[PDB]
């Protein structure tokens with residue numbers, strides 16, 4: 819099996835804007851998670867060819883990773899902060915769907931998700 823193409827990160831047909839919530843998601847939320855000890859399995863799409871996981875994209879039909887989210891923020895792909903929060907939540911849910919309790923990658927996801935939730939509790943005010 820091939821890997822699927824990664825998620826779209828730029829779309830010329832979508833309107834663009836900057837907002838303080840989007841700035842905060844990139845320059846505070848994403849940045850904090852990106853540097854975390856446990857972030858590396860989440861920094862790029864799962865390469866199921868290289869890792870020989872041919873069932874990964876038979877189970878996970880909405881793949882997402884922080885590399886894609888970073889590119890989406892940097893390309894102004896999101897209009898609403900909740901779109902970006904939704905992608906982080908998809909990334910974590912995909913981990914819990916594919917993996918078992920007790921697995922290392924689940925412990926890693928749980929720690930990142932805890933930190934993610936703490937950081938988005940401090941999202942600044944909407945315009």
Ligand SMILES: CCN(CC)S(=O)(=O)c1ccc(O)c(NC(=O)c2[nH]c(C)c3c2CCCCC3=O)c1
Pocket residue numbers: 858859860864865868869874912913916917923
């Ligand atoms: C091939 C890339 N590598 C060499 C260039 S690698 O980045 O060094 C590397 C090396 C060993 C690895 O197990 C990984 N695993 C992951 O990334 C990863 N992420 C997630 C969210 C998952 C997995 C795999 C476990 C099960 C599925 C899952 O939920 C990555």
